């Protein structure tokens with residue numbers, strides 16, 4: 462249930478992604494009412510965002526680092542599922558994904 466890693470995810474991975482210029486549409490859940498997307502919550506069975514991941518790291522939700530990494534990935538794949546390729550939100554998620562994977566490669570064991 463590695464804690465060096467969970468701590469790394471919070472202070473380094475999440476911190477870096479959260480500062481990114483493209484982070485803002487992923488810092489909270491997709492408000493399907495505001496954005497007028499009635500199908501979103503039927504299509505996306507496991508919504509995810511960095512708001513929720515942050516809360517989970519700050520409140521001892523995660524069993525281990527892999528469970529948290531799945532959530533980061535779910536956020537990205539949720540975005541690629543729902544939206545057409547080429548859409549701006551997809552380019553944004555793609556940039557965030559490069560960076561996420563970079564930072565994951567320097568993870569302590």
Ligand SMILES: Cc1cc(F)cc(C)c1Oc1ccc(C(C)(C)O)cc1-c1cn(C)c(=O)c2cc(-c3cnc(C4CCCC4)[nH]3)oc12
Nearest residue numbers: 485486487489490491492495496498539540543544549550
């Ligand atoms: C990044 C971006 C740029 C824009 F010019 C317009 C939007 C809506 C936009 O996305 C969002 C803006 C605000 C919010 C808030 C903060 C209110 O929850 C969310 C999004 C947004 C985030 N994520 C992860 C998404 O997957 C989608 C998807 C959409 C979206 C809204 N309308 C669409 C489609 C369906 C109608 C034709 C375009 N997709 O908006 C978001």
